[PDB]
Amino acid sequence: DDVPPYFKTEPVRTQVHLEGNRLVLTCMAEGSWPLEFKWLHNNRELTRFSLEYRYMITSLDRTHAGFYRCIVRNRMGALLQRQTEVQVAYMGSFEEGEKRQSVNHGEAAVIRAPRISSFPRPQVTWFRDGRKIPPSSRIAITLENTLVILSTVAPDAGRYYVQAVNDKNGDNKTSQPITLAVENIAPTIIIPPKNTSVVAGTSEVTMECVANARPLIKLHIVWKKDGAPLSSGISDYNRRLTIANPTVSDAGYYECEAMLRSSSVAPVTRGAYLSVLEPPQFVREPERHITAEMEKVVDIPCRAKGVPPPSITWYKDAALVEVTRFKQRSDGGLQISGLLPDDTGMLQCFAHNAAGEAQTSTYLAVT
Amino acid sequence: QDDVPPYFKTEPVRTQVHLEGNRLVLTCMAEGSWPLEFKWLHNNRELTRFSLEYRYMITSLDRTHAGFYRCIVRNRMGALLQRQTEVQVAYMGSFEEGEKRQSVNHGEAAVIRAPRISSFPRPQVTWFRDGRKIPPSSRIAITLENTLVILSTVAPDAGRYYVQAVNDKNGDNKTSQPITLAVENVPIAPTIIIPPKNTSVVAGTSEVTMECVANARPLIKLHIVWKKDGAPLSSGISDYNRRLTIANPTVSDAGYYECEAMLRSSSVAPVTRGAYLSVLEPPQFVREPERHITAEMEKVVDIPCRAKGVPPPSITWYKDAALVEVGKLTRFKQRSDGGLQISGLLPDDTGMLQCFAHNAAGEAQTSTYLAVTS
Ligand SMILES: *[C@@H]1O[C@H](CO[C@@H]2O[C@@H](C)[C@@H](O)[C@@H](O)[C@@H]2O)[C@@H](O[C@@H]2O[C@H](CO)[C@@H](O)[C@H](O)[C@H]2NC(C)=O)[C@H](O)[C@H]1NC(C)=O
Ligand SMILES: *[C@@H]1O[C@H](CO[C@@H]2O[C@@H](C)[C@@H](O)[C@@H](O)[C@@H]2O)[C@@H](O)[C@H](O)[C@H]1NC(C)=O
Ligand SMILES: *[C@@H]1O[C@H](CO)[C@@H](O)[C@H](O)[C@H]1NC(C)=O
Ligand SMILES: *[C@@H]1O[C@H](CO)[C@@H](O)[C@H](O)[C@H]1NC(C)=O
């Protein structure tokens, strides 16, 4: 008939799956006959148009990971689906071989964990000569799984290796030993806070600061958000700052201040920005159906807000609009001047972020 | 180091959706001294006995496997309760009901609820009249509950109505038995057929939708205005102004949302119906106990635990993965703030103490090892 395509629902932005498990992607669109469907992987065609609204993978492997989206069409026009990221849980082997490292006695030893390919990042247990190494006042283990001995002693010498476990599929692999040799002061920050981005509602995000001082027992780490002292979410010998349920208000400059108690010496601070992200949301949208006369000018509205502020891209029947008779306003609205009857079809406005994308559509009829 | 108390390196996701027939691997990512053993629970019922296996694996998921899973980790020092995960299984049953008959007066509203079908998640539903798709329109509304509402019936509305229901997670596609509608010949003020319902959502869900289906004669002059706490809204409104969708809901987005149905250019008074939007945030700890607590025998120790969230979180204490008796005539008392007070410390009070703050939006936990000296 004459019902333009439209989506009944949108897919989740991200989805994690096990290797060997089945994946079923759906294009939940409605519209007039014949409603046909085309699938894309990383914006590259997987299928040709058909009445099949599903894309099914019987047994997932790593090569299947990526962004999927469908294109729905009929006689009226075509729409680009909001894309979903399919992530496949896997774990490779430990690549590196045995290695050697040397540190001076009483100084900090920084031993980075051997690289292993894995999604998600694996949980890592450190071993010294077959014995587990839990965190302590002089032993720090970073979010990057880096081992940091704050003040080395002779019996620190030995063979260090990691056990890495993938929490999603339960894969468990052990690396080759790293031999540490121990060879015969104001507060310093060894592992500074890194810039961290997170989407609102992620439930947890952690900043980290590993500090060192002589004497070590007098070392005290103070956490601040935009200069304001923090007193919650702090753990792991004051090296981790964790924000539960982060919101855009939880964004800002988080600094780690390393100081010595009962000491005159000045503290040292290192800081990083926490970016809490909100996916795009439309403020103004075009009407479902727009009618306009030939050779005339039509203004099609599209405003969106998000954190960071969303960029706006227009599509005509699942294809990119070149902005010519087409102009895009600063607000993001589309202006089509000198309307031709062949400008008839589905126009789509995509508001995209680092946190995700949103879409709104309309059917333009040129009389 | 045979005396390192158990602790979790990470926690499982609060909710996870899986397909029938797919394999599930649950992990208890805990560290600690030997022997580190693991026990698994389904809806707080034991699945296994303690063992060195940190994984629980289901080869082929079905509907019965859905529910809450959590592990208990232990060693010589004590035991910790894992934060539990909800495993949800995507499925779809058959349409239970058979053919049915319905009657409406001409020019009046027809409300046809969709035939019940067992499915997770809720299926997307397309309505058909005599083999023809029924898209929403000025007189045709389709609710979030998949109910079909004809605002002003006419003679050719009579016929057989059925639904096509598709499960967007596994792509299952089933069709119901027809519902026969009869239109019987036997100026209507603006009324609200489907009023806004009380709706709850967790912050960061990215979308939550209120709905209001209104009816009036004439329908052409009918206009729906959406307001939050009395202030008219101009964004997130769609589906002929029947849907109000809030993207990226925050605690600030909570309040009283009312649907106002009015007739443009008309003497008649408008009608207003409203509901509450509850935006929820899972519990977050304000004050926590330290990693290790040492205390002298026969003395009193105060172990702190304060948490904030919406709704206000209730607080529950555990001693070695078992519920702590805070009831009267015990040595264990819970402060109003949520802190635990242990008076007359006995050497068997040594072990892992855990504080669980739980909401409707989820739970949070913090632990400590209590060592009682002398
Ligand atoms: C971390 O990133 C900042 C910039 O991040 C953005 O700007 C902030 C003001 C805040 O709005 C964040 O949420 C944004 O994501 C880096 O800041 C730069 O610093 C260099 C010198 O250090 C300066 O020349 C640049 O102008 C700054 N801005 C940019 C955009 O580069 C900062 O260096 C990063 N690293 C840290 C803090 O360790
Ligand atoms: C809906 O719920 C009402 C009470 O809801 C609670 O109180 C308000 C003030 C909000 O804070 C809300 O988040 C709470 O859950 C009931 O009074 C009412 O009967 C319920 N039903 C309807 C149809 O309104
Ligand atoms: C992981 O595998 C190693 C074998 O290399 C084994 O010693 C260790 O116990 C395993 N981890 C477990 C079972 O948690
Ligand atoms: C769903 O099943 C019905 C019933 O056979 C069929 O008519 C329809 O085409 C199916 N939908 C598809 C294949 O997308």
Author numbering:
A (entry chain B): 2 to 185, 193 to 331, 335 to 378
B (entry chain A): 1 to 186, 192 to 379
What does the published report state?
Sdk1 and Sdk2 are single-pass transmembrane proteins, with extracellular regions composed of 6 N-terminal immunoglobulin (Ig) domains followed by 13 fibronectin type III (FNIII) domains, and a relatively short intracellular domain terminating in a Postsynaptic density/Discs Large/ZO-1 (PDZ) binding motif. Here, we report the crystal structures of cell-cell adhesive homophilic dimers of mouse Sdk1 and Sdk2, each mediated by the four N-terminal Ig domains. These four domains adopt a horseshoe conformation, like many other IgSF cell-cell recognition proteins, but they interact in a unique back-to-back anti-parallel manner not previously observed.
Two crystal forms of Sdk1Ig1–4 were determined at 2.2 and 3.2 Å resolution respectively, one of Sdk1Ig1–5 at 3.5 Å, two of Sdk2Ig1–4 at 2.7 and 3.2 Å respectively, and one of the Sdk2Ig1–2/Sdk1Ig3–4 chimera at 2.7 Å resolution. Although the Ig1–2:Ig1–2 interaction is present in all of the crystal forms of Sdk1 and Sdk2, there is a difference in rotational angle between the two horseshoes of the dimer among the crystal forms, with the Ig1–2:Ig1–2 interface acting as the hinge. However, there are three Ig3–4:Ig3–4 interfacial residues that show non-conservative differences between Sdk1 and Sdk2 that are mostly conserved amongst vertebrate orthologs (H/S243Ig3, Y/Q289Ig4 and S/R296Ig4). These differences result in the Sdk2 interface containing a π-stacking interaction between Y245Ig3 and R296Ig4, which is absent from Sdk1. Mutagenesis of a key Ig3–4:Ig3–4 interface residue (N253E) did not prevent Sdk dimerization, although it did reduce the dimer affinity, particularly for Sdk2, which went from 2.2 μM to 18.9 μM, implying a small Ig3–4 contribution to dimer strength of around 1.3 kcal/mol. In addition to these major interfacial regions, the Sdk1Ig1–4 crystal form 2 also shows a small contact region between Ig1 residues E11 and R83 and Ig3 residue E212 towards the center of the horseshoe dimer. This interaction is not seen in either of the Sdk2 structures, although the residues are conserved.
